[PDB]
Write an enzyme that holds these catalytic residues in place. Sequence first.
Site, PDB file in Angstrom:
ATOM      1  N   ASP A  34       0.832  -1.178   0.000  1.00  0.00           N
ATOM      2  CA  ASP A  34       0.000   0.000   0.000  1.00  0.00           C
ATOM      3  C   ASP A  34       0.897   1.269   0.000  1.00  0.00           C
ATOM      4  O   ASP A  34       2.129   1.176   0.148  1.00  0.00           O
ATOM      5  CB  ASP A  34      -1.028  -0.043   1.150  1.00  0.00           C
ATOM      6  CG  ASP A  34      -0.393   0.003   2.513  1.00  0.00           C
ATOM      7  OD1 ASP A  34       0.402   0.950   2.765  1.00  0.00           O
ATOM      8  OD2 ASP A  34      -0.685  -0.903   3.378  1.00  0.00           O
ATOM      9  N   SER A  35       0.310   2.446  -0.195  1.00  0.00           N
ATOM     10  CA  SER A  35       1.139   3.655  -0.328  1.00  0.00           C
ATOM     11  C   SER A  35       1.769   4.059   0.987  1.00  0.00           C
ATOM     12  O   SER A  35       2.813   4.740   0.992  1.00  0.00           O
ATOM     13  CB  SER A  35       0.405   4.773  -1.042  1.00  0.00           C
ATOM     14  OG  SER A  35      -0.737   5.069  -0.292  1.00  0.00           O
TER      15      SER A  35
END
Length: 77
Positions: free
Chosen positions: A35-36
Site C-alpha cells: 500500500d502507499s
Amino acid sequence: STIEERVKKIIGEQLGVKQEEVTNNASFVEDLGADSLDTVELVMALEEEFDTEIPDEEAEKITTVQAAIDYINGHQA
Ligand SMILES: [Zn+2]
Ligand SMILES: [Zn+2]
Ligand SMILES: [Zn+2]
Ligand SMILES: [Zn+2]
Ligand SMILES: [Zn+2]
Ligand SMILES: [Zn+2]
Ligand SMILES: [Zn+2]
Ligand SMILES: [Zn+2]
Ligand SMILES: [Zn+2]
Ligand SMILES: [Zn+2]
C-alpha cells in the site's frame, strides 16, 4: 552482502514479502502487494540502511526493486 542484496532484504522486510518475490523488475504495489503507506515507510527505511537522504522528486519514481537498487547504487554514502 552486496548493495543489491541489502536493498532487496530491506524491501522484503518492509513490505513483508518472501525473498523469492523480490525480483529486480517487481513493482512494490503491483507485485509485492504494497500500500502507499508502506512505500513511504520503505523509502524511510532505505534512508536509514544506506545513510542517505532521498529527495521527494526521486523518491516518487522509486516504484520497483530495480529503481531502489539504482537509487542506492547511484548515491553511495
Ligand atoms: Zn550474496
Ligand atoms: Zn534484515
Ligand atoms: Zn508473497
Ligand atoms: Zn515468482
Ligand atoms: Zn490492481
Ligand atoms: Zn505505518
Ligand atoms: Zn533518520
Ligand atoms: Zn517521500
Ligand atoms: Zn512524495
Ligand atoms: Zn539524486
